[PDB]
């Protein structure tokens, strides 16, 4: 008689957290931001369109210089663009055609990708031979790679479909830390601005906050009904937003340890594929399966605009580090830069 | 200004070289058939091929079959990657914790999925020899509607087997065609085959069904179907 008592004890701790979270709930974010000036309609235009991918685009990432971006397409290609001039700097081929994520190093010297091969491949862009060649292949995940984000030129965190996140050492190719605790496939991750914590969104309709150094889960954020597809960090690092398959986005605060706001509309029934904030943290942009992206007033939960130029499912979406542009990829194999 | 003259000249030349390669391997991409080999369990899946990739060629047409290896049984997420394949090869062990209903429920999810509504399915019903042995020695209890089913008129006699096997194996084929026809039509199609673990001539059947899929797509674009 140990299984029965463990479940009862867990619920005693479970509702205690609910009471603690309910006790801290004084006023909603809507009430505090009820008398603030609304953003108003946001008009964004497709300044540039990047074409050259043979098949659907599954991921894209911006460079820290806010000019170069890498994009992954499931035709087996990883193209690096010069957004200003719409010129392909690189177009590297991948061993596996099923690539589900890509990352760009903060230094800009390395690029990463992964997918159904359960492998993260690091590519050296500044090779002395003049050509881009794969420098490392990180193996050890027992499920497909969903997301990867560089911390340095030597470390990277990867989420996988085996319900596990991992911290890697690229020089040795060994998994330094393993982050376990999720029940379903981990679909996304987001590093904090200080890169000492990160959040992961899984298919168990929950998110978790991890400590990179220690390697244990700090907090767990529930509130979504279905699988969480996208997650992003608020610019100051004290909050984050998540998008899910139940056609809603939610904002969670780490200190309050509770959901703050919900970004849903009755006319929206499709899931959210991508989520990103703006330079100030006032606009929350979310890509949808209904082929268009929605801009959300993050403080008032009022849809302030729509980005509609894609003919298929909007898979990826990111905002530059200076906030000057927004790039959206989609299953129609086209990227678009919006200003 | 001089520095930007050569940098733009060099950058425009690098893009030009890349687009020359991108058109060269676009031709290979379009002329290659990509297939997903999917099985609800063991089902003798590794008999059609005979971990993640296998290339073969029929009549100078390249096929690209992708078996699923170390992935978990939670297919709801990584199966969206295969919405643009030519066809999904679905392999069923017809001689079946009631693994036959599990294959029926899995086929129902694939057929009705939001992103897999344009993707055709090639259905291979394996274990034909094992199905013949079981019915002769004794699926009657698993499917209570079995003792109400008459062998269809347009059924191959298949000389060398008693009609009991033919009635049983055509009942299972009609279970998948019930799902295949009670849902979206014209956009995607089901091709059931009575494969067996004796001959590897199923490669010809995949070629014929892939040609049929492409022809139906072309006619569909011209509004001829």
């Amino acid at each position, epitope marked *: 008689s140990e299984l029965d008592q463990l479940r009862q004890e867990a619920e005693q701790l479970k509702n205690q957290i609910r009471d603690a979270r309910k006790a801290c709930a004084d006023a909603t974010l809507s009430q505090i931001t009820n008398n603030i000036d609304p953003v108003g309609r946001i008009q964004m235009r497709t300044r540039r369109t990047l074409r050259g991918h043979l098949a659907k685009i599954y991921a894209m990432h911006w460079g820290t210089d806010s000019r170069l971006l890498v994009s992954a397409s499931q035709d087996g290609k990883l193209i690096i663009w010069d957004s200003y001039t719409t010129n392909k700097v690189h177009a590297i081929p991948l061993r596996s055609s099923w690539v589900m994520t890509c990352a760009y190093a903060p230094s800009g010297n390395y690029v990463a990708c992964g997918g159904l091969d359960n492998i993260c491949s690091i590519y050296n862009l500044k090779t002395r031979e003049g050509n881009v060649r794969v420098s490392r292949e990180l193996a050890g995940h027992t499920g497909y790679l969903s997301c990867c984000r560089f911390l340095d030129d030597n470390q990277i965190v990867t989420s996988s479909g085996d319900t596990t996140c991992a911290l890697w050492d690229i020089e040795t190719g060994q998994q330094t830390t393993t982050f376990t605790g999720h029940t379903g496939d981990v679909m996304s991750l987001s590093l904090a601005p200080d890169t000492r914590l990160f959040v992961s969104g899984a298919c168990d309709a929950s998110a978790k906050l991890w400590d990179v150094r220690e390697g244990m889960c700090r907090q767990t954020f529930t509130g979504h009904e279905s699988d969480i597809n996208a997650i992003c960090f608020f610019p100051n690092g004290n909050a984050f937003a998540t998008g899910s398959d139940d056609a809603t986005c939610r904002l969670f605060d780490l200190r309050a340890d509770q959901e703050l706001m919900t970004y849903s509309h009755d006319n929206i029934i499709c899931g959210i594929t991508s989520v990103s904030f703006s330079k100030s943290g006032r606009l929350l942009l979310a890509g949808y399966d209904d082929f268009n992206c929605n801009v959300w007033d993050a403080l008032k939960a009022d849809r302030a605009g729509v980005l509609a130029g894609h003919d298929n499912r909007v898979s990826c979406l990111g905002v530059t580090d200076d906030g000057m542009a927004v790039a959206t990829g989609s299953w129609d194999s086209f990227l678009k830069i919006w200003n | 200004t001089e520095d930007q003259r050569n940098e733009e000249k060099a950058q425009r030349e690098a893009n030009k070289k890349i687009e020359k390669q991108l058109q060269k391997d676009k031709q290979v991409y379009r002329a290659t058939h990509r297939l997903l080999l999917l099985g609800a369990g063991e089902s003798g899946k590794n008999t059609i091929v005979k971990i993640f990739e296998t290339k073969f060629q029929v009549d100078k047409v390249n096929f690209h079959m992708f078996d699923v290896g170390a992935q978990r049984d939670e297919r*709801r997420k990584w199966i969206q990657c295969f919405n643009d394949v030519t066809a999904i090869i679905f392999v069923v062990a017809s001689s079946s*914790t009631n693994r036959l209903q599990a294959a029926l429920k899995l086929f129902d999810s694939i057929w*009705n999925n939001k992103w897999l509504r344009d993707t055709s399915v090639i259905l291979f019903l394996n274990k034909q020899d094992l199905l013949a042995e079981k019915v002769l020695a004794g699926i009657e*209890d*698993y499917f209570p509607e079995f003792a109400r089913y008459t062998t269809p008129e347009d059924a191959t006699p298949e000389p060398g087997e008693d009609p009991r096997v033919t009635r049983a194996k055509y009942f299972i084929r009609d279970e998948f065609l019930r799902i295949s026809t009670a849902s979206g039509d014209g956009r995607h199609y089901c091709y059931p085959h009575f494969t067996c673990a004796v001959d590897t001539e199923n490669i010809r059947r995949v070629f014929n069904d892939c040609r049929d899929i492409i022809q139906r797509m072309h006619l569909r674009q011209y509004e001829l179907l």
Partner: nanobody
Amino acid sequence: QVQLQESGGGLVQPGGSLRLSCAASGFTFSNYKMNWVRQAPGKGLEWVSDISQSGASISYTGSVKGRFTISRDNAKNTLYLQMNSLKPEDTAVYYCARCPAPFTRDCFDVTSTTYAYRGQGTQVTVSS
């Protein structure tokens, strides 16, 4: 927090009748298709029945068709499985499973790899 708690079960004589209730919370009940799955001892998860969002579409596994009937009430957020003529082959743990996404006809939910939106399970045992 998606929570599904099953109520009912127990030991009944062969040919008896039993009713199972699945209390749902943490999500909008009306937007999802609900299922019933069971796991007999020594075997894996088996799909028993499912009911659509409205309740118009209903399916059963052939082993229980004609005996079990499934119903949903979109006011109490509950799911029911009325079981009649329980033969000793129905001795299993019955789970209440929910399809992963709303407004969909697909459902990938029989997995033993810790499927998320599934209940704890009520053990239904039949013996003479």
